[PDB]
Write a protein that binds this ligand. Structure first.
Ligand code: A1BKL
Length: 167
């Protein structure tokens, strides 16, 4: 038993809800919140911009030190950093950005990072300003993640479409 509330159960381990991941993180304080990151950890907009704003830019400060030491992530890769006031940890995961021309096949590799964590709160990878089809992202999530994932979908209209079309 965990503290997530109001989710629809899609499969044995995948759950979905119309919610703002920022507000959801601030209430649940999950062990792991997933950020929709880029390889430079520049958290300017989309989910990443919103999570960082909620940390009063502390996420960005930590991220800049990480990149200065380690260099950029790989598309499809991840790193674990602090969750600041939102979660114990933040798993920064880089899904392909279609608006940059990146290979959509890398979306499965991106979701594989979730399997290193028993329970996670997450957005749909590569959705939103990353340009991928969210219905496809949900399909890849369900077919790749085996640990317990709680998906927060900000847009109410998109959520209903995701549910109604889920096979
Ligand atoms: C600030 C914020 N918070 C979120 N929490 C969960 N999911 C999110 N993204 C989407 O739902 C996909 C789109 C944007 C509807 C296509 C977001 C965003 C952009």
């Amino acid at each position: 038993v965990n503290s997530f509330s109001g989710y629809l159960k899609l499969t044995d381990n995948v759950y979905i809800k119309n919610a703002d991941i920022v507000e959801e993180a601030k209430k649940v304080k999950p062990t792991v919140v997933v950020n929709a990151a880029n390889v430079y950890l520049k958290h300017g907009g989309g989910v990443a911009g919103a999570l960082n704003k909620a940390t009063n830019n502390a996420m960005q400060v930590e991220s800049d030190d990480y990149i200065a030491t380690n260099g950029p992530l790989k598309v499809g890769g991840s790193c674990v950093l602090s969750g600041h006031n939102l979660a114990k940890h933040c798993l920064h995961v880089v899904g392909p950005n279609v608006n940059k021309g990146e290979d959509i096949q890398l979306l499965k590799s991106a979701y594989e990072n979730f399997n290193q964590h028993e329970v996670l709160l997450a957005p749909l990878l590569s959705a939103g300003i990353f340009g991928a089809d969210p219905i496809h992202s949900l399909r890849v999530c369900v077919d790749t993640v085996r640990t317990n994932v709680y998906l927060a979908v900000f847009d109410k209209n998109l959520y209903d479409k995701l549910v109604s079309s889920f096979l």
